[PDB]
From a paper:
The endo-chitinase Chit33 from T. harzianum is included in the GH18 family. Chit33 belongs to class III (plant-type) enzymes characterized by the presence of shallow catalytic tunnels and open substrate-binding grooves. Chit33 is folded into a (β/α)8 barrel domain, similarly to family 18 chitinases. The DxDxEx conserved catalytic motif is located at the end of strand β4 of the barrel, with Glu167 being the catalytic acid protonating the glycosidic bond and Asp165 playing a key role in assisting the acetamido group in its nucleophilic attack and stabilizing the developing positive charge on the oxazolinium ion.
To further investigate the substrate binding mode and to provide a platform for rational mutant design, we determined the crystal structure of the inactive double-mutant D165A/E167A with the substrate NAG4. The inactivated double-mutant D165A/E167A was also crystallized and used for soaking experiments with a series of chito-oligosaccharides (COS); however, only NAG4 was captured at the Chit33 active site, although a cocrystallization technique was also attempted with NAG3, NAG5 and NAG6. A clear electron density is observed for the tetrasaccharide, spanning subsites −2, −1, +1 and +2. All the subsites are highly defined though a large number of polar interactions that tightly fix the sugar. At subsite −1, the boat sugar conformation postulated for the bound substrate in a state previous to oxazinium intermediate formation was crystallographically trapped. Previous structural and kinetic studies on hevamine proposed the combined action of Asp125 and Tyr183 (Asp165 and Tyr224 in Chit33) in positioning the carbonyl oxygen of the N-acetyl group at position −1 near to the C1 atom, which would stabilize the positively charged transient intermediate during substrate-assisted nucleophilic attack. In our study, although we succeeded in trapping the distorted boat conformation of the substrate at subsite −1, these hydrogen-bonding interactions are lost in our double D165A/E167A mutant, which results in a flip of the N-acetyl group that locates its oxygen carbonyl away from the C1 atom. Structural comparison of the wild type and the complex with NAG4 Chit33 does not show significant differences, apart from a visible reorganization of the Asp117 and Arg274 side chains that approach the substrate, enabling direct polar links. In summary, the major structural trait of the Chit33 binding site is the presence of the non-conserved residues Asp117 and Arg274, which act as a clamp that may fix the bent conformation of the substrate that occupies the full catalytic groove, conversely to that reported in hevamine. Nevertheless, it is remarkable that we failed to trap the Chit33-NAG6 complex—an issue that can be explained by looking to the crystal packing, which shows that the non-reducing positions of the active site are blocked by the small loop following α8 (Ala187-Lys192) from a symmetry-related molecule.
Residue numbers in the entry: 19 to 321
Write the structure that this text describes.
Amino acid sequence: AGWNVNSKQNIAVYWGQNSANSQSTQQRLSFYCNDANINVIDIAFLNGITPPMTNFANAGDRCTPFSDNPWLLQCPEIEADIKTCQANGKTILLSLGGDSYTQGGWSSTGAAQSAADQVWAMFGPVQSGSSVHRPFGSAVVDGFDFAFAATTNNLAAFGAQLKSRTNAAGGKKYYFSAAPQCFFPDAAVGALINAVPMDWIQIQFYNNPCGVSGFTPGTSTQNNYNYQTWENWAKTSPNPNVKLLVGIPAGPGAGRGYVSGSQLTSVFQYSKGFSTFAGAMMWDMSQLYQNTGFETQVVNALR
Ligand SMILES: CC(=O)N[C@@H]1[C@@H](O)[C@H](O[C@@H]2O[C@H](CO)[C@@H](O[C@@H]3O[C@H](CO)[C@@H](O[C@@H]4O[C@H](CO)[C@@H](O)[C@H](O)[C@H]4NC(C)=O)[C@H](O)[C@H]3NC(C)=O)[C@H](O)[C@H]2NC(C)=O)[C@@H](CO)O[C@H]1O
């Protein structure tokens, strides 16, 4: 039944950017929807908002660009796969931003609110009165992951507008996550996560000295790995019950600070000791499935 707020064994994995970067390393989204251990998948990425742009690496080969927006894709296989994964009990979020989002956000709260309403009309419930293009057709995402990586002006107003629309919606629960890097405070999404309630924060504990590679096994005195800082922040955040996922690279090619073996088991045992801990996040599906035995290491570490 997808995201489980009462579990310490949630696993969120990104799909779409083919980090492993080979012809065969990223199968279609539904290939990965028979994995009992992966209950949340983030589709990466809507890497342009105003104007809209979608990039799904070589999954774009089975999409058709919209005639009036060549950077926006119509993706019938992703549409079908979202519906299949949802039928299979997976929570499917759309990830906004990524390291290729260059638009810098919005100059006004009004522009940010309009942009949020466009994203909601494009990926939320189908709107009968709307002319907006729908990359995933009649599929409806289960929410949004905020993975902005650079200065995004008025991201707080964008997020608050999108949260307003999901809070007003019928049908199903919509989830909000954010993917800050572990450096505290986070420059890209810090203002957003201090203003807008999130269901969980999936912290990138990699590409930075505060990452899992900096964890010191055998002690609960941690000079580098800063989960404790994030837990302290969580308790007074807009959702004081917000959960944290420990985000890690799924292979040595996925990011700096890949860990495995006893370092991996130890940092997860340490993190599991905290009331906010809800499981793991991984970048990304292509790397995870190429890295034989790594998923079993992560599953075994969360037990
Ligand atoms: C606080 C601070 O500024 N820290 C600096 C680091 O940010 C910086 O390294 C960069 O870190 C970000 C965050 O970890 C990283 O982007 C994420 O992580 C992966 C890579 O590990 C990215 O993956 C790429 O995504 C694109 C699509 O946008 C693909 O084209 C490509 O295949 C991916 N590459 C790989 C190898 O997987 C994601 O976009 C993003 N993930 C999420 C959840 O948003 C950047 O890639 C890092 N940049 C560089 C140049 O390494 C670090 C080094 O510059 O310095 C810190 O100080």
